[PDB]
Amino acid sequence: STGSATTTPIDSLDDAYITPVQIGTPAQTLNLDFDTGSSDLWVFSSETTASEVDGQTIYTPSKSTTAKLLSGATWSISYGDGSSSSGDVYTDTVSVGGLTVTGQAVESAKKVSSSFTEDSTIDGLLGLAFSTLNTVSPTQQKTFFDNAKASLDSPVFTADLGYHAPGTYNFGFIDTTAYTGSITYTAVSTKQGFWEWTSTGYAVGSGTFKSTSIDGIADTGTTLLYLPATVVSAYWAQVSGAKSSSSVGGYVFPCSATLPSFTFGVGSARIVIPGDYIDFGPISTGSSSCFGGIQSSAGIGINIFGDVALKAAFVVFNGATTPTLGFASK
Ligand SMILES: CCOc1cccc(C(=N)N)c1
Ligand SMILES: CCOc1cccc(C(=N)N)c1
Ligand SMILES: CCOc1cccc(C(=N)N)c1
């Protein structure tokens, strides 16, 4: 089997992407944030505290003929940005892009934090990291990908995120029309539950490539590219008037700047992030200070190849017995 779904930016800045997901019988379609840095499939629901729902589409398990309470099971997640949610758990039929899993754990939110309430466009999360990170207790649950794997034509999914435009998540096959050149594969460590890999270095603009190992995670559910302070300083030093602002919470730069590209290494291959991908717009409406898309990972404890980086590539998440990542230009 395979599946193929379009993923769409939630706003003009590509702050996240939403992918329609069918849950239950008859189908209830919710728009989920596919997150390769978490392992929970959770949704706004008929159980979510009413004052915490503001425009989301909710899952109502009582309207699904296939919804089964996973009795006793609870979940609670805390994300890197400080946001959170928690609740109880139903198993139900879940389909993505024509690929169906029966008996998927669907984590129903009873509570969500303010960041989630205030984002009307995201109806929940679909985690695609390793199932060792799933938060369901007392019986940990599998991701949609782990449950689908055995049925897929190939044990893979691919992320092809758009730059100010829609893109695609495919399951079970690699669309050889969707990228240019060849795919370079690199080793993955699953020790922390993430798609963790080591970049071979970086370049800023037209500058020389610096060969240096950068451990980090391929994380579709993070907007920005978080790298070591040395690398980030070297990038922003090439932008006149850029500075790190403790008041704003990262590097800002004059909106009248043209940003240099950023290259990262994947083995002997190179992925080039165009400068305009690193523009995340005025810090507040009408400001002439713009927010940077490359930020320091100092204090986060891991480097994150988030959407700024991933949207410059066709990315293969190879879930074979020995997992690997692949990157191609596009
Ligand atoms: C406290 C949450 O910490 C992280 C760290 C790394 C990834 C993610 C994620 N869900 N994409 C969340
Ligand atoms: C790791 C993914 O963290 C997310 C994703 C999408 C939305 C939010 C939020 N704060 N409302 C947080
Ligand atoms: C370019 C001329 O004026 C603007 C104004 C505001 C933001 C930006 C930007 N760099 N995102 C550019």
Nearest residue to 195 via CA among 215, 179, 214? 215
Residue from 240, 253, 256, 283 to probe ligand 3 pocket by mutation (most atoms less than 8 Å from CB): 256
Which domains are seen in the chain, by residue range?
A: 5-174 (2.40.70.10), 175-330 (2.40.70.10)
Residue positions counted in the chain: 330
Q: How far is the CA of 125 from the centre of ligand 2 (A)?
A: 8
Q: Write the DSSP string, 292-318.
A: ESEEE-TTTSS-EE-HHHHTTSEEEEE
- Ligand 3 and 275: CB distance under 6 A: no
- Ligand 1 and 307: CB distance under 6 A: no
Report the C-alpha gap between 279 and 257 in whole angstroms.
10
C-alpha angle with apex 186: 184 to 192, nearest 5 degrees? 145
218's enclosing H/E stretch is: strand 210-218
Nearest residue to 151 via CA among 36, 3, 326? 3
Structure tokens at 287: 């400001």
Q: How far is CA 155 from CA 3, 17, 170, in A?
A: 12, 23, 11
Residue 137 pairs with which residues in a beta bridge? 74
Report the C-alpha gap between 184 and 188 in whole angstroms.
13
Q: How far is the CA of 161 from the centre of ligand 3 (A)?
A: 23
Report the C-alpha gap between 159 and 174 in whole angstroms.
10
Please answer whether residues 308 and 232 qualify as being in contact, where contact means their C-beta atoms are separated by less than 8 angstroms.
Answer: no
Please answer whether residues 278 and 265 qualify as being in contact, where contact means their C-beta atoms are separated by less than 8 angstroms.
Answer: no
Give the closest residue (by CA) to ligand 1 atom 5. 80
Q: How far is CA 205 from CA 81, 200, 239, 265, 270, in A?
A: 29, 17, 11, 14, 13
Report the C-alpha gap between 248 and 283 in whole angstroms.
8
**Which residues carry out catalysis?**
35, 199
Report the C-alpha gap between 44 and 63 in whole angstroms.
15
- Ligand 2 and 116: CB distance under 6 A: yes
In the chain, the amino acid numbered 94 is V
Q: Among all ligands shown, which has an atom nearest to the Cα of 193? A: 1
**Determination technique for this PDB entry?**
X-ray
Report the C-alpha gap between 47 and 85 in whole angstroms.
12
What single DSSP character describes residue 183? P
Report the C-alpha gap between 227 and 296 in whole angstroms.
5
Q: How far is CA 288 from CA 23, 249, 252, 281, 285, in A?
A: 43, 16, 10, 9, 9
What single DSSP character describes residue 59? B
